[PDB]
Amino acid sequence: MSLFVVNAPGHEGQLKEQLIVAHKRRPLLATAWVNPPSVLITNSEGEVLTQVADPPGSTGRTHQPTALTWHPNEELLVIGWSNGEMSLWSMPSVSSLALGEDYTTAAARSAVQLIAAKAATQSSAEGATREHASGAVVASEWSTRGLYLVSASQQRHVVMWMLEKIPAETSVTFKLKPLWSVQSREPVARIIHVPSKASDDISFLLADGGTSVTAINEDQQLFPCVTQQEQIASVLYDAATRTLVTLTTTSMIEVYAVGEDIKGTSTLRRKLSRIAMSMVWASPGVVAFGSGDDRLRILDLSSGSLDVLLLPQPDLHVSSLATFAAKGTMIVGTVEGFLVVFQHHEASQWEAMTVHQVGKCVDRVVLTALGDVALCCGGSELQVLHEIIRKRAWDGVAAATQISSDMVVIESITGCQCLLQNKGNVHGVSIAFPNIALWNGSQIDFYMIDEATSEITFINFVLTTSPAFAIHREGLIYVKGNRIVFETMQLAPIAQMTFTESEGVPVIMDIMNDYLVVVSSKNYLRLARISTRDLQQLGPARPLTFPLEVSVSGARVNAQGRRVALMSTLGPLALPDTRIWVYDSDTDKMSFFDFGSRNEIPNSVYWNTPEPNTTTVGEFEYILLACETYQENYAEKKAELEDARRESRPHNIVTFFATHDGLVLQNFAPLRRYQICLVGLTIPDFLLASVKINGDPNNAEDYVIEQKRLRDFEGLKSDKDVAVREALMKFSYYATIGNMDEAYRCVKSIKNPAAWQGLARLCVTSGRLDVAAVCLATMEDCVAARALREAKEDYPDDQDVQLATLALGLSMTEEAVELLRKSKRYDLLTDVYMACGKFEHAQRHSERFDRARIRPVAYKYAQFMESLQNMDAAIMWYYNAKCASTDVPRIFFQTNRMHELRQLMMITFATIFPQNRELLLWWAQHSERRHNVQEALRFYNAGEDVYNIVRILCSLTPPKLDSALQLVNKEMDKAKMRFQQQQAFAEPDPVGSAYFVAQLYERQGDDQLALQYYQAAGAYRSGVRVAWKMEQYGVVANLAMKSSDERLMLETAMALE
């Protein structure tokens, strides 16, 4: 998280939209004002250096500065006025003094820059009004090497100016001499330069806002380069690839390739689907533009594909654009007053880094050399915004968090809260309760905190420019020169220590409890112990090795003064780095961890901060490190809806265990949008600064010091016991290092079941089971214990299913379903999906992966509706489970809805039920129960159940033998059809119903017919008993052996005798 400190140096005049100029490399900035017309020259951070009034020789008339331009290398400014004159503002160079290299601090360099700019000179170029024909100088442009100047007036004239850098006795002066006098069609809106070689030649382009883009070279002729059918709006040029882009007022863009003679050939032509359109270079070969709408548009010249970069907030309209190619940041300014900063990791590769709300109509956005954002807003308002990190501090009693340019919220865990507004800005904050101190560059102001009356009593200031300072209970430590001085709150000098220039100047100073860490500008680190009288240094300076240029930006020290966490930045532009550095001074070892693998960039890193008069803190609590980084279930959500309403780039609070064997990743925790920042670590409680309920982040009062328990400290809300807490710390440490046996040993002495559920979760994540049985048995959770025991009994060869069962018992659902996806067990996964009240997921999983447990899903839904007593869906879901022969009749009979079933079966329910075969057979059986024989026969015929029809027909009085014989012979013909098909592919299938017919003949003496129909039916046992009748015994053979029934053959062998 970052915030833009705002400097708004007012001027008596009115600001101009496009008249802000920023030097590319030197931290300089200048802008024009009118009535009274002047120019304000300021540094990158926004402090005013100088102001320059009307050009020399003016006869009482103030002249409006109409054009400004910076020299690409020299700290030289050129100003074209409105009366035809031209002036050059030049300050004496700092390096001409040939002083020492003691300018290692920004404040000293700013001071020498200011004292150099005080004696600056504004020189007049002779005869400028003659060359511009008494016309206002509309535009100006230096060459790439800064040797040639081009000026354009309002009288349609273009003049070439030669720069002569002559040496003098004390400095180097500059003379501008006119060379040409070139006529233009219209006053030139923009002058661009083309270099001969990609990285002294004459190659310029002039755009006058009309239908002409006139090139010019050393030939002194204004030959056009490219002319289009419409009036041009703007031109955007890439010097490295010599790529020109012409944009018209009608949302038309053309891409040209500039040759040696400044001639363009069209290769990419495109159309875009009051604020004038703006267009800037987002990346080499990638152009970003906006048409005053809510969307950005990004064009890739290499591929020709145009994408739209969306803004989630409606009503926003882009007003101006700028880009910083060094870090890849676009600064979108809006009419409302919203500044959006985009940082690179074609539209999918960009992201919104941050959002800022200045709150005024942004006329123009400019970017200085160091990355500061100058803003012309409100017509006559200049605001320089400098990105600084959120300066937050915590001592052990209260937290002081910076939330704006100057507002600081100081709040304690006891309920005390107060607001601090510094007279100047805020750059550093140090708290050692009740002492508070703020550093704003030039001076450090230290006050007290009156907790009883919520007052802040100002003690005093020290006029020091040290970037490193720290206030303590006994006094304040601040750097002054090459030395550091530790004093009291009443400016009583207690001690001081001095360092040589070869040892550098301290840049980082961090104190906590009674330990101090000092880091210089050349990676020199010193650790010391503060006392009541002296500062006992522990060892000499130690160099550190980092396996462009690495500069350490921050240093934190644990409460032992033994291990140091280090934040470093890359390059002179201070690009944040994705590495955390841990240094063990006692063992003199250097370890690091990379945040690039997690796609995260850190902001701050914090050690554990023990409370005052609390000496029961072990070294495992001291080695813990915390850092902030940034990249069907209807009665379920309402339980956490209170938290969801308490909610009214992602945050990652990540904690490591700093080990002498290396850095081990302990735990990770996402945050929410109302938890703005982490102010420090107070074991076992995170100290996230948060906004209150239904609050606003920009409000100063709307801030509370929120305290959330660690993810490894579940179930410990008393925060009183010490032995349990330290044993849990050791358990977490041994779980992270993988020493699960020592974790078991540590939790064995803990009577809190929270340690046991932590160990059970560790067993889930480590594949341990017999220890997990003890974990479940210690928490008095017999449900999970018996579930694990049955899982072991049912699956003795699979530990994955047992682990999934344990995780499900431990309220770990997502881990369990992922494990069961890994473990192939889709049926158990479907059962779990049903058991969590998600029948839609069960249906999808059944229809996608395992298409064999969809009937259980339907049946379980039917039972769910039956218990819910929504029978309208219960009946249709019992039908969908293909169990309409046992359950839908049951659900009709039990609810006494028999009349509706009778009406349904008499022939949404009537569309499906009457034609179902199983329902018809059930109703036939039910009517046969009611002795309604004829209705049963009718329904059996409608359901095509030959066995039951033959049984009833043969059981009737008189027996309807003819139709029974017809059906029996039809089934015999079907069986013979099957056997003939089998033989053509190369004793048919017996027909059971024929058995009944034989029984009739068995009661009528028709022995031969009874035997024939028994044999056709497959009644070998009855075949024997009917073969015994007259005399035949061979027919007894070939029957028993067909059944492979040993008893039959045995008995026949006995009976043959």
Smaller CB separation from other proteins, 308 or 852:
852
Q: Which is nearer to other proteins, 61 or 848 (CB)?
A: 848
Alpha-carbon distance of 682 to 606, in angstroms, equals: 10
3-state secondary structure of 972: helix
Residue 809 CA neighbour count, 13 Å, CB half: 29
Of 90, 91, 86, 65, nearest in space to 13 by CA: 65
- Residue count at the site for other proteins (CB under 8 A)? 4
CB 852 → other proteins: shortest distance, Å?
6
| Identity of the residue, 219 or 847, whose beta carbon is nearer to other proteins in the bound complex | 847
Q: Say if CB 150 and CB 204 are below 8 A apart.
A: yes
Write down the least CB distance from residue 623 to other proteins, Å: 57
CB 984 to other proteins: min, Å = 11
Q: For residue 132, give Cα distances in angstroms to 39, 80, 157, 185, 688.
A: 21, 11, 6, 14, 63
Q: Which of residues 488-507 bind other proteins (CB under 8 A)?
A: none
Residue window 942-981: x/- pattern of binding to other proteins, with contact defined by CB under 8 A: ----------------------------------------
Residue number, 676 or 857, with CB nearest to other proteins = 857
DSSP string of 415-433, one letter each residue = S-EEEEE-SS---EEEEET
| Long-range Cβ pairs for the range 637-645 (8 Å, 24+) | 645/693
Restricted to residues 514-543, the positions that interact with other proteins (CB under 8 A) are: none
Give the whole-angstrom CA distance, residue 200 versus residue 829.
Answer: 73
Residue 23: count of CB within 10 angstroms of its CB: 21
CA 855 to chain centre: 41
Q: How far is the CB of 918 from other proteins (least distance, A)?
A: 15
1010 CB burial (10 A radius; 0-12, 13-18, 19+): buried
Is 149 in contact with 106 (CB distance < 8 Å)? Answer: no
1046-1053 CB contacts, 8 Å cutoff, 24+ apart: 1048/1020, 1048/1021, 1048/1024, 1052/1024
Q: How far is the CB of 857 from other proteins (least distance, A)?
A: 14
Considering only residues 601 to 640 of the shown chain, the ones binding other proteins according to CB under 8 A are none
Cβ closest to other proteins, residue 726 vs residue 850: 850
Pull the structure tokens for residue 516: 């101090």
CB burial string 419-430: b at 16+ within 10 A, e below: ebebeebbbbbb
Q: What is the dihedral sign for C-alpha 664, 669, 670, 673?
A: negative
> Given candidates 548, 597, 985, 1054, which one binds other proteins under the rule CB under 8 A?
985
**Shortest CB 922 distance to other proteins, Å:** 21
Smaller CB distance to other proteins: residue 886 or 1004?
Answer: 886
In the complex with other proteins, the residue whose CB is nearer, 289 or 879, is 879
Q: How many CB atoms lie within 10 A of CB 647?
A: 10
Closest approach of Cβ 854 to other proteins, in Å? 9
* Single-letter amino acid code for the residue at 532: T
Q: Are 41 and 53 in contact (CB under 8 A)?
A: no
What interhelical angle do 961-985 and 1007-1017 show, nearest 10?
50
Is 851 a binding residue for other proteins by CB under 8 A? The answer is yes
Smaller CB separation from other proteins, 275 or 852: 852
Closest separation in Å from C-beta 975 to other proteins: 21
Helix or strand run (H / E) with residue 207: strand 203-207
Tell whether residue 1030 is a contact of other proteins (CB under 8 A): no
The Cα angle at residue 49 between residues 43 and 50, in degrees rounded to 5: 135
Minimum separation from the CB atom of position 851 to other proteins (A): 6
Smallest gap from residue 952 Cβ to other proteins (A): 28
Give me the least distance between CB of 982 and other proteins, in Å please: 10
Per-residue binding string, other proteins, 755-794, x by CB under 8 A, is ----------------------------------------
- Please tell me whether residue 835 binds other proteins under the rule CB under 8 A: no
Which C-beta is closer to other proteins: that of 639 or that of 986? 986
Q: Give the integer Cα–Cα distance in Å for 722 and 101.
A: 53
Question: Please, which residue, 641 or 986, has the CB nearer to other proteins?
Answer: 986
> Are 380 and 34 contacting, i.e. CB atoms less than 8 angstroms apart?
no
To other proteins, the closest distance from the beta carbon of 883 in angstroms equals 15
Alpha-carbon distances of 965 from 159, 742, 835, 938, 990, rounded to whole Å = 121, 84, 54, 18, 15
Measured from the CB of residue 295, what is the shortest distance to other proteins in angstroms? 48
Closest by Cα among 905, 914, 993, 915 to 949: 993
Question: Which CB, 634 or 985, lies closer to other proteins?
Answer: 985
> In this complex, which beta carbon is closest to other proteins, that of residue 691 or of residue 884?
884
Q: What is the dihedral of CA 841, 844, 850, 856, to 10 degrees?
A: 70
Site string for other proteins, 17-36 (x = CB under 8 A): --------------------
* Min separation Cβ 251 and other proteins, Å: 51
User: Can you tell me which residue has the tokens 């140090």?
Assistant: 430
917 binds other proteins (CB under 8 A): no
Pick 819 or 881: Cβ nearer other proteins: 881
Nearer to other proteins, 115 or 852 (CB): 852
Site for other proteins in 873-902 (CB under 8 A): none
CB 827 within 8 A of CB 815: no
Residue 921 CB, shortest distance to other proteins, in Å, is 19
Q: In angstroms, what is the minimal distance from the CB of 875 to other proteins? A: 23
Query: What are the two backbone dihedrals, phi and then psi, of residue 861, each rounded to the nearest 5 degrees?
Result: -65, -40
Of 421 and 980, the one with the shorter C-beta distance to other proteins is 980
Residue 852 binds other proteins (CB under 8 A): yes
Judged by CB under 8 A, the residue of 986, 1030, 1054, 1056 near other proteins is 986
Query: Least distance to other proteins from the beta carbon of 1044, Å?
Result: 22
Q: Gaps in the chain (C–N > 2.5 Å) come after which residues?
A: 199, 273, 345, 547, 631, 648, 907, 986
Nearer to other proteins, 168 or 986 (CB): 986
Distance CA 456, CA 149 (A): 57
Residues 6+ apart with CB under 8 A from 24: 70, 72, 369
Q: Which is nearer to other proteins, 588 or 847 (CB)?
A: 847
Reduced 3-state DSSP string for 722-786: CHHHHHHHHHHHHHHCCCHHHHHHHHHCCCCHHHHHHHHHHHHHHCCCHHHHHHHHHCCCHHHHH
> Which residue's CB is nearer to other proteins, number 390 or number 853?
853
Judged by the rule CB under 8 A, the positions of this chain that interact with other proteins are: 851-852, 985-986
